[PDB]
Amino acid sequence: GPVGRLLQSQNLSVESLGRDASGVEMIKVDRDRLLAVCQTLYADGFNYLRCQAAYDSGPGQDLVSTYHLIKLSDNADRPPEVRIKVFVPRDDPRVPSVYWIWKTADWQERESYDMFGIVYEGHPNLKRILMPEDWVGWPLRKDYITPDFYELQEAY
Amino acid sequence: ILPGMTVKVTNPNDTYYQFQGIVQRITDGKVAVLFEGGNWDKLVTFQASELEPVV
Amino acid sequence: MLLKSTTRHVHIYAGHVVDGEVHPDTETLTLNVDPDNELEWNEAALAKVEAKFRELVANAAGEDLTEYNLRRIGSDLEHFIRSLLMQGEIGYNLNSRVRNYSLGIPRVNH
Amino acid sequence: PAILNPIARPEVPQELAENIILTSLNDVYDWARLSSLWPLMYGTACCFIEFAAMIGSRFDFDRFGLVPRNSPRQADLIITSGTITMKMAPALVRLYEQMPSPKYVIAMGACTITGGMFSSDSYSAVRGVDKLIPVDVYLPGCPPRPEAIMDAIVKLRKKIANEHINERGNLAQTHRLFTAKHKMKPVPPILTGQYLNAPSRQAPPP
Amino acid sequence: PKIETRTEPMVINMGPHHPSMHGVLRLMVTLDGEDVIDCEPVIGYLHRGMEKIAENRTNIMFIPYVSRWDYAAGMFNEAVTVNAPEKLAGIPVPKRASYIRVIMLELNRIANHLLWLGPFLADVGAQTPFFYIFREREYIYDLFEAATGMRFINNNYFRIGGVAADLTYGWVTKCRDFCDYFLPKVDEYERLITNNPIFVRRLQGVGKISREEAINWGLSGPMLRASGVKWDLRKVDHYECYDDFDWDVPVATEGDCLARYIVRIQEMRESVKIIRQALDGLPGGPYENLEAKRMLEGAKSEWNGFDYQYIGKKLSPTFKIPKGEHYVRVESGKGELGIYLIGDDNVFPWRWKIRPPDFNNLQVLPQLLKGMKVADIVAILGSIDVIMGSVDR
Amino acid sequence: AIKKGDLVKVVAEKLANSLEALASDHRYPPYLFEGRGEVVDIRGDYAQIKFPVPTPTVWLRLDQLEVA
Amino acid sequence: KFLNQITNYAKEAVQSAKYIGQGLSVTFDHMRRRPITVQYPYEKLIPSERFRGRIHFEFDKCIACEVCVRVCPINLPVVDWVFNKELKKKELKHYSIDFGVCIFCANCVEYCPTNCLSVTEEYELATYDRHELNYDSVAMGRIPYKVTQDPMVTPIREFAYLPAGVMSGHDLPAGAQRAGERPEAIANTAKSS
Amino acid sequence: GLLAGYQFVKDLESAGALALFVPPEGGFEGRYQRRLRSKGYTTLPMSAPGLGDLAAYLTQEHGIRPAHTGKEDIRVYFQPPLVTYHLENLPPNAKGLVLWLIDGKRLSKQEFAYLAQLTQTLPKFKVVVEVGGDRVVRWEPLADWVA
Ligand SMILES: CCCCCCCCCCCCCCCC(=O)OC[C@H](CO[C@@H]1O[C@H](CS(=O)(=O)O)[C@@H](O)[C@H](O)[C@H]1O)OC(=O)CCCCCCCCCCCCCCC
Numbered sequence A: 001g002p003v004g005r006l007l008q009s010q011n012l013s014v015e016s017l018g019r020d021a022s023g024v025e026m027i028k029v030d031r032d033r034l035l036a037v038c039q040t041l042y043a044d045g046f047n048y049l050r051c052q053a054a055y056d057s058g059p060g061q062d063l064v065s066t067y068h069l070i071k072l073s074d075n076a077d078r079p080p081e082v083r084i085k086v087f088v089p090r091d092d093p094r095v096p097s098v099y100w101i102w103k104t105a106d107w108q109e110r111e112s113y114d115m116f117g118i119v120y121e122g123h124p125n126l127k128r129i130l131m132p133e134d135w136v137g138w139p140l141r142k143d144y145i146t147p148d149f150y151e152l153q154e155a156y
Numbered sequence B: 001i002l003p004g005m006t007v008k009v010t011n012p013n014d015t016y017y018q019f020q021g022i023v024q025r026i027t028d029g030k031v032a033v034l035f036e037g038g039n040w041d042k043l044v045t046f047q048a049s050e051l052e053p054v055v
Numbered sequence C: 001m002l003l004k005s006t007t008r009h010v011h012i013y014a015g016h017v018v019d020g021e022v023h024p025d026t027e028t029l030t031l032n033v034d035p036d037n038e039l040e041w042n043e044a045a046l047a048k049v050e051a052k053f054r055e056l057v058a059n060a061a062g063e064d065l066t067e068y069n070l071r072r073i074g075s076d077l078e079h080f081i082r083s084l085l086m087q088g089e090i091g092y093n094l095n096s097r098v099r100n101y102s103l104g105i106p107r108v109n110h
Numbered sequence D: 001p002a003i004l005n006p007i008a009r010p011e012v013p014q015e016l017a018e019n020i021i022l023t024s025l026n027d028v029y030d031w032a033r034l035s036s037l038w039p040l041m042y043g044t045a046c047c048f049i050e051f052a053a054m055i056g057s058r059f060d061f062d063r064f065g066l067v068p069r070n071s072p073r074q075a076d077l078i079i080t081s082g083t084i085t086m087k088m089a090p091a092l093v094r095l096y097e098q099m100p101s102p103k104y105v106i107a108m109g110a111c112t113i114t115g116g117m118f119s120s121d122s123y124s125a126v127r128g129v130d131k132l133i134p135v136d137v138y139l140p141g142c143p144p145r146p147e148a149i150m151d152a153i154v155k156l157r158k159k160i161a162n163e164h165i166n167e168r169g170n171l172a173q174t175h176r177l178f179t180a181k182h183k184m185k186p187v188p189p190i191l192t193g194q195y196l197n198a199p200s201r202q203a204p205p206p
Numbered sequence E: 001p002k003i004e005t006r007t008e009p010m011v012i013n014m015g016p017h018h019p020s021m022h023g024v025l026r027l028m029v030t031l032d033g034e035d036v037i038d039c040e041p042v043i044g045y046l047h048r049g050m051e052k053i054a055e056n057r058t059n060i061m062f063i064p065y066v067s068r069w070d071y072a073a074g075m076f077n078e079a080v081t082v083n084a085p086e087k088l089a090g091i092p093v094p095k096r097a098s099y100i101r102v103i104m105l106e107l108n109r110i111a112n113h114l115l116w117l118g119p120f121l122a123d124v125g126a127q128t129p130f131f132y133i134f135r136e137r138e139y140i141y142d143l144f145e146a147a148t149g150m151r152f153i154n155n156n157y158f159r160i161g162g163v164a165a166d167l168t169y170g171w172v173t174k175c176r177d178f179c180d181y182f183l184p185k186v187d188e189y190e191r192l193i194t195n196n197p198i199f200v201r202r203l204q205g206v207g208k209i210s211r212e213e214a215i216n217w218g219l220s221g222p223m224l225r226a227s228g229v230k231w232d233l234r235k236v237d238h239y240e241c242y243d244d245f246d247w248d249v250p251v252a253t254e255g256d257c258l259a260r261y262i263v264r265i266q267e268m269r270e271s272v273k274i275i276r277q278a279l280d281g282l283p284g285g286p287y288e289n290l291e292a293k294r295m296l297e298g299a300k301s302e303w304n305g306f307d308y309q310y311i312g313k314k315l316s317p318t319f320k321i322p323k324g325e326h327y328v329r330v331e332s333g334k335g336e337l338g339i340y341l342i343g344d345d346n347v348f349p350w351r352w353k354i355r356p357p358d359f360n361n362l363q364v365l366p367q368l369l370k371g372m373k374v375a376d377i378v379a380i381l382g383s384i385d386v387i388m389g390s391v392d393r
Numbered sequence F: 001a002i003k004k005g006d007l008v009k010v011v012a013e014k015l016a017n018s019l020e021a022l023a024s025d026h027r028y029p030p031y032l033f034e035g036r037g038e039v040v041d042i043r044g045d046y047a048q049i050k051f052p053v054p055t056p057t058v059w060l061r062l063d064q065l066e067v068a
Numbered sequence G: 001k002f003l004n005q006i007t008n009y010a011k012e013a014v015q016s017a018k019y020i021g022q023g024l025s026v027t028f029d030h031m032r033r034r035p036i037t038v039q040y041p042y043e044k045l046i047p048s049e050r051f052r053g054r055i056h057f058e059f060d061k062c063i064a065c066e067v068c069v070r071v072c073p074i075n076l077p078v079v080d081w082v083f084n085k086e087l088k089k090k091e092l093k094h095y096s097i098d099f100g101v102c103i104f105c106a107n108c109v110e111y112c113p114t115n116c117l118s119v120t121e122e123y124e125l126a127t128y129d130r131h132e133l134n135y136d137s138v139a140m141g142r143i144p145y146k147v148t149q150d151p152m153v154t155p156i157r158e159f160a161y162l163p164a165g166v167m168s169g170h171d172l173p174a175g176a177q178r179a180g181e182r183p184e185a186i187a188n189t190a191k192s193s
Numbered sequence H: 001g002l003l004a005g006y007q008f009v010k011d012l013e014s015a016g017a018l019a020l021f022v023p024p025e026g027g028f029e030g031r032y033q034r035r036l037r038s039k040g041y042t043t044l045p046m047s048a049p050g051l052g053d054l055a056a057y058l059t060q061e062h063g064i065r066p067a068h069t070g071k072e073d074i075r076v077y078f079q080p081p082l083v084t085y086h087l088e089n090l091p092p093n094a095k096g097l098v099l100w101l102i103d104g105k106r107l108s109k110q111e112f113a114y115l116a117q118l119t120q121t122l123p124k125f126k127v128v129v130e131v132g133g134d135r136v137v138r139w140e141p142l143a144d145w146v147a
C-alpha cells in the first residue's frame, strides 16, 4: 500500500489488511510499536485523527483499537487518509496512548476505555466519561450482563 | 356514501380540497376517508356533505 | 457529601436522620420506604421489609460504598416490595392522590 | 392471591366539608393556584426544545399564567422533558423533593412515561419517570406538538381545580425510616477538580 | 449558617440542571478571583446507549433512533445513517433525491445555526432574540411538517435508495417565499447586533485556538473554519450534488468567539444561496409540474426515468447490509459526523459507532478556559454549540 | 443440542471461571437462572441470548448453557 | 498619546448611545405588529397532510402478518392471532399498541400491506393514568378528531398551505388555496393549447 | 354566576348521567367535581379515549395485553371490571360512585346511549362526560343530547 510501503523504508514492518470499500487502506500495527508508527506518520503529514474508538472483534476472540488518519491540507481535494488497527488480546492487555503525539485521544480513548475496558498506557485522566464512574462492566463488550436494576426492569 | 367507495373532497375551506381517497369507516353521519399518498396512509374524518362519490 | 439510592418508595442514604437532616456518616444506611404513600402498609409488612433490608445490607456486604452498590441494594429492596404487593400483603393507597399504578395494575391471578 | 396488586379498601370514609362559605373559599384557593403555575426550567433532551417552542411567540404559555422559573424553590410544576438516564435519576428526584409541597409533575414525551424508544436494549435509561416521582399527567409522543403540551396543561388545570383544602393531609411524607450498620470500606471520590493541573497532563511518562 | 471564606482556589459546580438550552453538563470549575484555573467537564448525563442499540436493530428500525444524536438538525445524522449502508451496497441514488436531500440538509443547517444563535445572543445580552429565532425557526418546522411527517427531529424522511417520498405540491414556491423572507434577516441580525461596541468587546479575544492547535485538537466544525482552515467535508469529499452550486466556504483567521459567530452567520447566509440555487434546478422542478408531465406523457417518456424518481428501488426491511467496514462522513451543523459501520453478513451491524463533532469540539473546554474570566464561561460554552444528544457517544 | 430458540439457562459456575465473564460484574442478576433464555443466533461456538428483560442481548458460549 | 484615547472614548460612547437608541426604536416598533401567537385552545393549528398522529386500525382489514411488529423500532404492536383450522386462515384475537411506548414514526403504517393501519391528526392525547394509553382493537378506530369540525376553534393553516407571498395565516380570507395549481389542473390547461 | 351552589349534585342524582360543556381551558369544572366529592360521592376520571367496548371495560372483565417489546412473549392480565371493582372499594359512608370521562367528544352516540342506560341499572353509579363545548360550564342530561 502507498502508506504501507511509506513506512517500509523506515525499517519497521506492519501487516496489510487492504482497502475497505472506501479506498482507505488498513494496516495492522502491532500493539508494542504503535507509538513508532504513529510518530513516523505524524512526521509524514498525518496530523488529524477523526476517529479512535475500539471494537470487539468477536464474543471472546479479542478487542481492536482502530485509529484513523488524514493529511488535512487547506482547500484540499480527496486526501490519502490512511487508517491503522491494533489487536489487543482480550483478558489482560491494553494499548499505548497516542494523546501525546496528537490529541483528541483524551476523550476518545477515555470513551473506549469506558465502553470496552481497553486501558491506555500513559493516558492522562483515564476515567469514565459516560457510564457513571462507580460503574463496573465495560458495557459495550459483546458479552455484558446488565445488572438487575429496578429502573431498568419495565414500565409495568 | 358507503365504505369502500372512492370519493373526492368538495369544500374550498379545507386543507384536503380536491383530494381523493377511500372511505374506511362511517359512524354517526360523519365519514373517515383514507388518502393513500406520499408515504403514510392518512385518515381524516369529513362530514357527509364535504365529499363526492367520484366514479 | 451524601451517597444515596433514591427511587420511588425506596430511599437509601448514607447517614443518620437526627431530626430531619441527613448528616453523612459512612456507616448508617438509613432507609425511607414509601415516603409519598403510594401504598398502604401494615405492621407485619414493614417488619418484613426491615428484615429484608437488614439481611441485604449485613449478610451480603464486604464491598465498597460506591453509589453503584447502594443502587444495587435499593433495587433488591424494591423488587421485594413489588413481590409483597403481588402476593397481596400490601396494596395501593387509593387515596385522592395522583394514583398512577407504578408497580402494575390490579389483575385477577388466572 | 385472589386479586393481584390489590387496592386499599380503607376506613374512616372522608371527613369532608359542605358549607357554602368554605367551598366558595376553596374555589379561590384552587383558582389562584392553577392559573399561576410556574414551571421549572428543566430540560434534558429533545423534548425540551419543543417545550422552548411552547415558550416562544408562536404560542406562549404566558397566557394562563406560566412563567418559567430557574430554582426549584419557586417552581410548583416540573415538566420532565427528556430521557432520564441512571446517571441523572438522583439529580431529578433531588430537584423534585427540593421544591415546595403543593407541586405537580407532567411526563412529556414517550421517554418519561414508559421509557420510550429506549425501552429495549438500553442499559442506562430509566424506563419511565413514574418509577421516580408521582406523575400527574402523561402526554405521549416523540416530541409532542407544543399544543399537546398545552393540552396536558389543560388536563392538569382541571385536575388542580379538583383539590380540597380540607384534604391537604394527603400531601406530607410519612417517613417510615429505619437504620442498619454496615461494613463497606468507604472509598475516595474520583470526581474533583484537577483537570489541567493534574501531573499526568504536563509531560508524557518515560 | 455561613461559608467561612478562606484563601484557596474556589470550586463551583455548574451542575446538570442548566437553566438554559445547553443540555445537561456538569462543569466542575475552579477559579482564583474571577479567573479559571482548570475545569473538569462531567459529561454523560444523557448516555442512553445508542451504540449498543444500533447493533441489534435493522436499518429501517434504527433510522428513527438517529434523529436524537445532536437533536436539532435531525437530518444530518439521518443522512449519514442512510449513507453508511448505501456506500457498502453501492446503491445508486437518483439526482432528484440528491437535490431533495441537499435542500433538506441546508434547511437543517439554517435551523441548527438559528438554534445556536438564539441562546448565544441571550447569554451575551437580552432574551428577546430567543423569541425571534423561534418565530423564524418555525417557518422551517412548518416546511418539514409538510414534506416529512413531523417538524424537526423524528422526520425519518431519508431512505437508503433515496428519500421516503416526493415533496408536497405547493412546496417549492413556499420554500422560495421563506428564503426571500429570511435572507434579509441574517443581515438584520448583524444590523441590530454585532456592532454594539460593548457587545463586540465582550467576545473580542476571549476563547482562542491557533490554527495548528485546532488541527491537533481535532475541531472539525466551524470551530476549525474560524481558525483559518478552508476545509469542509462538502468541498473536500465532493458530497453528492455539490460542485453543482456556487461555493464560498467562510473562514475567519483569529479563532475567537467573534470569529465563530461571523463564520456561522456567513454559513447561514451561504445556505440560502445553496437552497435558492438548487430549487431552480431540481431534476423535474416542482412536484406538481413533474406529476403533470408524467400524467401527460410519462407513461413511457423520459420523465418517468430513473434520474427523476425520488427513490431507487424500494428495499425490504431485511436489507442485509454486506460485509466490510468503512467510515462515512457528513459536514453537519457542528462539523463532521462519522459512522464507523462494520457489518458482517446480516441486518444487524457489527459495531455501529458514531463520531459526533460536538464530542471533539468540547475537548477544548478547559484549554479555552485557561484563565479568561468567570463571566465569559457561558459565552465560550455557547460559542461551541454544545448538544448533549451528540455527547452520548 | 442448543439451537433454534431453545430456552437456555446459564448453569451456575462454568460462567464465572472462564475468563470471558470478566466483562460484567462479579455478582450476577437473578434473571440468568430462569428457564427463559431464547437463543437468537449461533456463531459456531458462541450464542446470543435474549433474556426477557429490556436489556441488551448477551453473547455467551454453549459451554455455559443448558437446555433447561 | 492622550487626545487619541479621548477621541476613541467619545467615538465609542456616542456609538453605544446610537446603537441603543436604534434598538429602542426597533422594539417600540415591534409592538404595532399583529401577534403571531396561535392561541391554541381556541385557535388550534390545523396539521399538515402527512402529520403522524395516533394510529388508526381497521380490525376487518388485518391479516395478522405481523409486519407492523417487525418494522417497528421497538416491536411495539401486540398482535394476538390463533390460526384457525378452516383451511389456513389466521384469525386475529387482539391487536393493541401501547401509545405510551409509541414513537410515532409510522413505520407500521408504511408497511401495512392491506391498508389496515393509518395515521391520523390526533395530537391531543393526554391522560392521568398511563395504563389507559394501551389502546384496544376497538379504542383505535374511534373516528379521529377533525379540529375543523369544532364549534369553539378557529382553525389556522400552517406555512405550507398559505397562498403565494402570504406568511402568516391569521387574517386570511375564506377562499385561499395552498400555493399553486394541482397536477390535474396543469394537465387540463396543457390539454387546451 | 361566578359562584355555584349544589344544583349540580341534585341534577346528577336526578338524571344519573350528565354531559358537561366546559370551556376549553379546563380549570372551571374541577370545582363541580369537588362539589360532587364533598357530598359523599367518589369520583374517578379515566379519559374515555382509551377504553374498549365500554361494556367489557366497565361491566365485564377484559384481558389487557401489555407492551412486550421483543422480550416477554404475549401475556394477558385480565384486570377486573373498572366499576364493579370500585363499587366494592367505596369508603364506608359513600353515597355512590360517579364516573368522570374527560374527552367525551371521542366517543360515539352508541357509546353515549350505553353509558346513559348503564346508570339506571347498577344503582350506586352516576356518570359525567365532559363533551367539549360552551364558554360556560353548563350541563345537560346525557339521556338527552342524543337523538
Ligand atoms: C393592603 C391591602 C391589600 C389586600 C389584598 C387584597 C386581597 C384580595 C383577595 C381576593 C381576590 C379574589 C379574586 C377572585 C377573582 C376570580 O375569582 O376570578 C374570576 C374567574 C374567571 O372565570 C369566570 O368564570 C365564569 C365561567 S364559569 O362558569 O366559571 O366557567 C365566567 O364568569 C368567566 O369564565 C369568568 O368570568 O372565576 C372563576 O373562574 C371561578 C372561580 C370562582 C371564584 C369565587 C368567587 C369569589 C368569592 C369570594 C369569597 C366570598 C365568600 C362568600 C361567598 C358566599
Ligand code: SF4
Pocket: D045, D046, D047, D048, D081, D082, D083, D108, D109, D110, D111, D112, D116, D117, D141, D142, D143, D144, E068
Ligand atoms: S421523549 Fe422522544 S423527543 Fe423527547 S428526548 Fe425522548 S426520544 Fe427524544
Ligand code: SF4
Pocket: G061, G062, G063, G064, G065, G066, G067, G068, G069, G079, G111, G112, G113, G114, G116, G117
Ligand atoms: S395491520 Fe398490516 S402489519 Fe399489522 S398485522 Fe395486519 S396486515 Fe400485518
Ligand code: SF4
Pocket: G055, G068, G071, G072, G073, G074, G075, G076, G077, G097, G101, G102, G103, G104, G105, G106, G107, G108, G109
Ligand atoms: S408508530 Fe412507530 S413504534 Fe408505533 S407501531 Fe408504528 S412503527 Fe411501531
